[PDB]
Amino acid sequence: RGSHMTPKDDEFYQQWQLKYPKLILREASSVSEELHKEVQEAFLTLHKHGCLFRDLVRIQGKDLLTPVSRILIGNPGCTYKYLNTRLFTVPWPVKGSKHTEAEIAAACETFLKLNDYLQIETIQALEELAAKEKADEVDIKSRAAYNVTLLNFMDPQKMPYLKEEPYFGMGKMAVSWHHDENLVDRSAVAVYSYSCEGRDPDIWHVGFKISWDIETPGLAIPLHQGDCYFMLDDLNATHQHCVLAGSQPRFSSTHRVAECSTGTLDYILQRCQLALQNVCDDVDNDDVSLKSFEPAVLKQGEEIHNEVEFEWLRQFWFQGNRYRKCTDWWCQPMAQLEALWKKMEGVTNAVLHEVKREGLPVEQRNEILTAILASLTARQNLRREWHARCQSRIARTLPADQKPECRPYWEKDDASMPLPFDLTDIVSELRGQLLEA
Ligand SMILES: O=C(O)CNC(=O)C(=O)O
Ligand code: NI
């Protein structure tokens, strides 16, 4: 009989200490009045401005719209990827940084100082966690250094299509069992929970279970207005969590140390520069000339081409143009990444021209093909996929406000583009060439 425990159970606290000690609870009374007020107003102000969107994610080969509406706020340039969906931050006024609106801007600043507070609290609890055990400081710091927060909202009246928690009888899930993805290893998660206005169905909870385990009773922690909780250290790997919906509207701010080593603007721009190092860059025009046809440089060039195409452009435009409502931060850089990408289409075309010329001895030609074939095939496949993902029956359900675009995309007739969008014919011919005997 799979069951769960709440504070009403005799064994709840002992079971908390024994099998969920890296979960920590900070009651609303630990956070100042003024911060509570400011943070709640910020939630209401972002909601009023319609800044929260259910995400069209992908899970086990299926297109699925998250019951919760969400918004990512964090360090300018930074991204958070989950369920094959890359969220772009609406930026908060971090040091040394004209893109958002008055009220919206104010709300970001507010979640910034909320971030400062939780980070200090996270550091305290981690120091205490280390002090308990055995009965570096830089590790701690880095594992409390929240660079983003994913805000969640749900009005169970307006979103009643909630699944039943299937293992412990926790009732309705606002967010189903999961691990938070794309997180720096052993990094903490801090959560401020704002409700309006077995377990009490009417009240929001966060649920926890041990991974692989539905025999250990799950824990259901009641959240009220301003209660925060923290997942410390490896809790997020060793356990799964969910959100059990109550009956009133509720928000949360989930601060994370996103693992953005390949997930920031500066990083992708640097990779684009790396790739274009192989092109004569005296002038910006269509006659792309390449400096080298060394297998490794061409492989890299085509790989980066794929990276900016599908991890940045197609992602951004698939959700888009939707965070344009809250900010114009990404307009210019996404245009730039597209200009850099269009050049890479020029580069690919120049590689194809080089393989397709008379003088090239068969041996070097085959070198080139082998270096670029994996990338071009991944290009065709990821293009089919994204194009389908933009045209699914549920993408088309979304308002024009959030209509997914399949950009960049062009027809055959389009003279402005050197290569067709569909590479089936090209990839087929390269395969045949490599098979030539
Ligand atoms: O909203 C909460 O309390 C918990 N949030 C999540 O688990 C999440 O969005 O990943
Ligand atoms: Ni989560």
Side-chain angles (χ1 to χ4, degrees), residues 47 101 110 112 189 201 243 256 272 287 337 340 343 348 367 372 399 420 427:
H47 184 264
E101 283 173 327
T110 286
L112 177 54
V189 176
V243 175
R256 305 131 180 273
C272 284
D287 214 69
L337 291 175
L340 291 164
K343 184 109 290 176
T348 300
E367 231 164 48
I372 78 182
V427 170

XYZ file of all heavy atoms in Angstrom, residues 47 101 110 112 189 201 243 256 272 287 337 340 343 348 367 372 399 420 427:
150
model
N 2.106 38.546 -14.084
C 0.901 37.843 -14.501
C -0.030 38.806 -15.233
O -0.536 38.492 -16.306
C 0.205 37.270 -13.271
C -1.001 36.440 -13.576
N -2.281 36.954 -13.555
C -1.129 35.127 -13.878
C -3.142 35.994 -13.847
N -2.469 34.875 -14.042
N 10.054 46.721 -19.960
C 9.126 47.795 -19.569
C 9.260 48.184 -18.095
O 9.867 47.459 -17.310
C 7.683 47.378 -19.838
C 7.276 47.453 -21.293
C 5.900 46.872 -21.532
O 5.536 45.909 -20.829
O 5.183 47.382 -22.418
N 13.237 42.831 -8.507
C 12.686 42.232 -7.297
C 13.037 40.743 -7.162
O 13.340 40.272 -6.065
C 11.156 42.398 -7.259
O 10.830 43.756 -6.940
C 10.530 41.479 -6.219
N 15.565 39.543 -8.495
C 17.012 39.564 -8.325
C 17.354 39.622 -6.837
O 18.137 38.817 -6.339
C 17.659 40.739 -9.070
C 19.175 40.860 -8.882
C 19.873 39.557 -9.243
C 19.720 42.015 -9.721
N 18.706 24.113 -4.957
C 17.563 24.787 -5.554
C 16.773 25.453 -4.430
O 16.485 24.834 -3.394
C 16.676 23.806 -6.366
C 15.430 24.490 -6.909
C 17.476 23.221 -7.517
N -6.164 18.393 0.134
C -6.282 18.627 -1.308
C -6.289 20.118 -1.623
O -5.798 20.528 -2.671
C -7.659 18.030 -1.651
C -8.045 17.180 -0.458
C -7.391 17.810 0.710
N 4.846 18.742 -7.723
C 4.081 19.779 -7.057
C 2.637 19.306 -6.999
O 2.072 18.939 -8.016
C 4.199 21.107 -7.804
C 3.307 22.140 -7.179
C 5.652 21.578 -7.804
N 17.887 28.379 -9.467
C 18.739 27.276 -9.886
C 20.099 27.809 -10.279
O 20.220 28.963 -10.707
C 18.135 26.597 -11.112
C 16.720 26.134 -10.937
C 15.818 26.563 -12.063
N 14.452 26.081 -11.853
C 14.003 24.894 -12.244
N 14.806 24.044 -12.867
N 12.749 24.551 -12.003
N 30.754 30.772 -32.780
C 30.498 31.238 -34.145
C 31.790 31.869 -34.718
O 32.163 31.604 -35.856
C 29.331 32.241 -34.195
S 27.636 31.528 -34.041
N 30.210 35.507 -51.604
C 31.253 34.630 -52.124
C 32.201 34.122 -51.032
O 33.375 34.490 -50.962
C 32.028 35.302 -53.251
C 32.469 34.311 -54.306
O 31.584 33.784 -55.020
O 33.689 34.049 -54.417
N 23.089 36.131 -34.519
C 23.312 34.693 -34.638
C 22.768 34.194 -35.960
O 23.295 33.242 -36.518
C 22.651 33.919 -33.498
C 23.233 34.096 -32.101
C 22.364 33.344 -31.109
C 24.662 33.617 -32.041
N 25.255 35.286 -38.651
C 26.425 34.410 -38.557
C 26.107 33.031 -39.118
O 26.926 32.403 -39.789
C 26.910 34.304 -37.107
C 27.519 35.603 -36.549
C 27.620 35.582 -35.056
C 28.881 35.834 -37.129
N 25.997 32.928 -42.984
C 27.335 32.795 -43.498
C 27.722 31.324 -43.469
O 28.291 30.819 -44.417
C 28.295 33.623 -42.661
C 29.716 33.638 -43.169
C 30.096 34.998 -43.767
C 29.381 35.259 -45.065
N 29.651 36.616 -45.612
N 29.082 25.918 -45.865
C 28.705 24.573 -46.286
C 28.692 24.498 -47.805
O 29.254 23.577 -48.403
C 27.322 24.158 -45.743
O 27.332 24.185 -44.307
C 26.975 22.763 -46.201
N 38.123 12.114 -47.637
C 38.401 12.727 -46.336
C 37.319 13.760 -45.950
O 36.746 13.723 -44.846
C 39.767 13.408 -46.364
C 40.688 13.035 -45.220
C 42.135 13.416 -45.509
O 42.383 14.566 -45.940
O 43.021 12.557 -45.326
N 32.332 15.679 -42.834
C 31.074 16.426 -42.819
C 29.772 15.605 -42.877
O 28.692 16.147 -42.655
C 31.059 17.457 -43.968
C 30.761 16.791 -45.308
C 32.394 18.190 -44.027
C 30.774 17.765 -46.482
N -1.983 30.605 -29.393
C -2.314 31.906 -29.993
C -1.188 32.445 -30.883
O -0.049 31.967 -30.793
C -2.517 32.816 -28.772
C -2.794 31.900 -27.642
C -1.999 30.665 -27.922
N 19.415 24.393 -50.504
C 18.022 24.090 -50.153
C 17.876 23.783 -48.666
O 18.828 23.346 -48.039
C 17.711 22.843 -50.984
C 19.034 22.194 -51.191
C 20.026 23.323 -51.310
N 22.744 14.924 -49.211
C 23.249 13.853 -48.361
C 23.272 12.509 -49.095
O 24.175 11.703 -48.881
C 22.418 13.726 -47.077
C 22.778 12.460 -46.318
C 22.633 14.939 -46.212
